[PDB]
Amino acid sequence: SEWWKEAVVYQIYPRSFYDANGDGFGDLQGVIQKLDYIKNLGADVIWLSPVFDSPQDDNGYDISDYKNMYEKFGTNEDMFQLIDEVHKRGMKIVMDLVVNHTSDEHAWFAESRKSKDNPYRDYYLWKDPKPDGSEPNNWGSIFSGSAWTYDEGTGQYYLHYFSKKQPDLNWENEAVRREVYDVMRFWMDRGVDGWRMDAIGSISKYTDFPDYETDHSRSYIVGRYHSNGPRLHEFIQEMNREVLSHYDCMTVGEANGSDIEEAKKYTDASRQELNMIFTFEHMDIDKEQNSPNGKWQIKPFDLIALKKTMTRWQTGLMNVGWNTLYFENHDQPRVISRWGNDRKLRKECAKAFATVLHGMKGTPFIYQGEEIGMVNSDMPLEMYDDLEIKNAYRELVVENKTMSEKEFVKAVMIKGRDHARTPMQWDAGKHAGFTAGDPWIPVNSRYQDINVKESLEDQDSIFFYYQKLIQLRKQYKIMIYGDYQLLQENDPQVFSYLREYRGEKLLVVVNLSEEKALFEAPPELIHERWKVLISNYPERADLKSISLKPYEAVMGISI
Numbered sequence: 001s002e003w004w005k006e007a008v009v010y011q012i013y014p015r016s017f018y019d020a021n022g023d024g025f026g027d028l029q030g031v032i033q034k035l036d037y038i039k040n041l042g043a044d045v046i047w048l049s050p051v052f053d054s055p056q057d058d059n060g061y062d063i064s065d066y067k068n069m070y071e072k073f074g075t076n077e078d079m080f081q082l083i084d085e086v087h088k089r090g091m092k093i094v095m096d097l098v099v100n101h102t103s104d105e106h107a108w109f110a111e112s113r114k115s116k117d118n119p120y121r122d123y124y125l126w127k128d129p130k131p132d133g134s135e136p137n138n139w140g141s142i143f144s145g146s147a148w149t150y151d152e153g154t155g156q157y158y159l160h161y162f163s164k165k166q167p168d169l170n171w172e173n174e175a176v177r178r179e180v181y182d183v184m185r186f187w188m189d190r191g192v193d194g195w196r197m198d199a200i201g202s203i204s205k206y207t208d209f210p211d212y213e214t215d216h217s218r219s220y221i222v223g224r225y226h227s228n229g230p231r232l233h234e235f236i237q238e239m240n241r242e243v244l245s246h247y248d249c250m251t252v253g254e255a256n257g258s259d260i261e262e263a264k265k266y267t268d269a270s271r272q273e274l275n276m277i278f279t280f281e282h283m284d285i286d287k288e289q290n291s292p293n294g295k296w297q298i299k300p301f302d303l304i305a306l307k308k309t310m311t312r313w314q315t316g317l318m319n320v321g322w323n324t325l326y327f328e329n330h331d332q333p334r335v336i337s338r339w340g341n342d343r344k345l346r347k348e349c350a351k352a353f354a355t356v357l358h359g360m361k362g363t364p365f366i367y368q369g370e371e372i373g374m375v376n377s378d379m380p381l382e383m384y385d386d387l388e389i390k391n392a393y394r395e396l397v398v399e400n401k402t403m404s405e406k407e408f409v410k411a412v413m414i415k416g417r418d419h420a421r422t423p424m425q426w427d428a429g430k431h432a433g434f435t436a437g438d439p440w441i442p443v444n445s446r447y448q449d450i451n452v453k454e455s456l457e458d459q460d461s462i463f464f465y466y467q468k469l470i471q472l473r474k475q476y477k478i479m480i481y482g483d484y485q486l487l488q489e490n491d492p493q494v495f496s497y498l499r500e501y502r503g504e505k506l507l508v509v510v511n512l513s514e515e516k517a518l519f520e521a522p523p524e525l526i527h528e529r530w531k532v533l534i535s536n537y538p539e540r541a542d543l544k545s546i547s548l549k550p551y552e553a554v555m556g557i558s559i
């Protein structure tokens with residue numbers, strides 16, 4: 001019944017969504033002007049990536065003021081208008097709560113770093129060097145190198161799981177927890193309907209700061225201590241009591257480090273923590289388990305791995321907790337370029353991934369441009385902006401030489417976060433109609449073929465297929481509330497599953513390959529009668545045997 005169970009969320013990356021004022025940078029009035037597009041697609045919740053003041057070292061995820069906008073986005077007045085405009089359309093708005101860390105340019109850190117007696121000293125995590133001057137331990141940053149940076153003025157290191165310009169907050173300090181709760185109330189009292197909680201898995205530290213054990217492949221290590229800390233769930237339960245229980249809200253945690261048991265801790269309603277989380281396990285199927293090259297040590301797409309991972313999540317949260325459903329966000333490449341065909345079969349592939357995802361139990365998330373089949377960019381490496389890439393090149397290619405330049409370029413072309421961050425493609429005109437000026441990063445060179453304007457003129461578009469999926473969700477309660485059973489589990493091409501609710505069945509059959517495949521219903525389903533709800537090819541309704549063309553996707557309901 002809860003609105004968030006029945007929602008479809010559209011994720012905006014606002015610097016890349018619409019530039020209303022011509023500076024090349026997407027803005028809050030831009031978002032306003034495109035709200036009717038999102039409403040017409042059908043999404044009823046928007047998640048806005050962070051627009052708070054920030055020096056932009058990590059494109060807004062390094063916050064220097066939680067109570068004001070970054071000037072290129074607009075002012076608080078424009079934010080308040082956006083909240084009001086969202087509400088007027090019967091929609092909800094979720095903001096990005098970034099409270100594992102702040103910018104080093106936040107007033108709190110500028111103060112903390114001055115002296116050991118500063119009142120903000122213990123807002124962050126400061127530790128003495130080892131006796132040889134080296135770092136307190138061997139922990140690494142997610143953006144390469146050490147998780148510790150030295151401050152000459154006070155003789156201590158500070159912790160940062162992310163960039164050196166993202167010092168981690170000290171959640172052991174009650175003053176810090178109180179500062180966070182007051183930020184949350186400020187915005188929720190002003191109409192924000194919930195939060196996406198950035199790196200929420202990291203807020204509790206192992207306060208002994210133990211070294212990782214090692215066998216020798218790397219100097220700095222990112223591992224189990226970087227998430228799922230001993231006080232994590234205590235802190236989120238306190239957040240619930242102090243803040244979330246006082247509002248009609250939605251929460252989604254970006255649960256780095258999460259496995260299915262951790263997800264039950266976050267999401268079981270009886271624990272009074274969060275409503276849902278993002279996991280990375282389905283996004284992690286195409287990296288090697290633990291290479292020094294991390295995410296950049298790529299493996300080919302393995303459908304059986306995807307099936308097994310997603311099924312573990314569907315079954316684990318079937319009757320407790322709640323799933324998020326996503327393949328794209330501002331941190332992930334375009335799924336059709338990563339794992340499918342983004343050329344002659346692009347429309348069929350995009351619709352196929354959409355069908356697998358939207359037929360599951362949980363809340364779907366559509367990332368800007370996914371609904372039109374946006375693709376990875378062919379831009380050269382020198383055009384990429386992401387500090388993750390810049391830092392990984394220097395560590396992996398230049399310094400440690402654990403990847404060649406050619407290997408690393410290839411990996412970036414597949415997984416770079418910037419594939420998600422090139423401007424939204426509105427039309428075929430200059431800069432895809434994203435700006436009249438010069439965009440902050442180039443528009444994908446394929447935009448004249450892939451844009452909203454052409455999609456709305458094509459009844460076979462990916463857009464209309466997404467719009468139909470979202471309508472179907474609203475019409476067929478089985479899509480929200482049904483259980484889940486994987487079918488024909490061993491097929492290396494076909495992802496097929498069944499939902500059941502109140503005597504109805506929903507069969508989802510998707511060929512996630514470029515070659516022909518065959519689905520045969522299991523014996524218990526062979527005498528069912530079906531109506532086809534949606535297909536990405538022209539179709540019929542004898543779903544007991546389906547000869548599947550490349551990327552063919554079908555969803556049928558029992559009648």
Ligand SMILES: [Ca+2]
Pocket residue numbers: 019020021022023024025026027072
């Ligand atoms: Ca602008």
